[PDB]
């Protein structure tokens, strides 16, 4: 079946999901990654502009999702 994972995710030899950062196209090295609150994609910190971990209580959206959101001037 072609249904594997057409996304930035692969499995290792044991069968764990290894997320690939769509930012650099590099896999996870056991690195701190941030998941978007919309697409749930997994990017590395230096790839999106994160340097310290924000809480799950605070939302964050990647350059993918935050762009469609736009974060318009009107608030």
């Amino acid at each position: 079946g072609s249904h594997m994972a057409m996304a930035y995710v692969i499995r290792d030899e044991w069968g764990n999901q290894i997320w690939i950062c769509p930012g650099c196209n590099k896999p996870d090295d056991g690195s701190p990654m941030i998941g978007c609150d919309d697409c749930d994609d997994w990017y590395h910190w230096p790839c999106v502009g994160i340097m310290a971990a924000p809480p799950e209580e605070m939302q964050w959206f990647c350059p993918k999702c935050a762009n469609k959101i736009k974060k318009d001037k009107k608030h």
């Binding site: 290894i18 997320w19 996870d28 056991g30 690195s31 701190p32 990654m33 941030i34 998941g35 609150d37 994160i50 971990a53 924000p54 809480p55 799950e56 605070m58 939302q59 964050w60």
Partner: peptide, 13 residues
């Protein structure tokens, strides 16, 4: 903002 490190060894966390 789900932040986690897939680590079996991390310094601090």
């Amino acid at each position: 903002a789900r932040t986690k490190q897939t680590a079996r060894k991390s310094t601090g966390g």
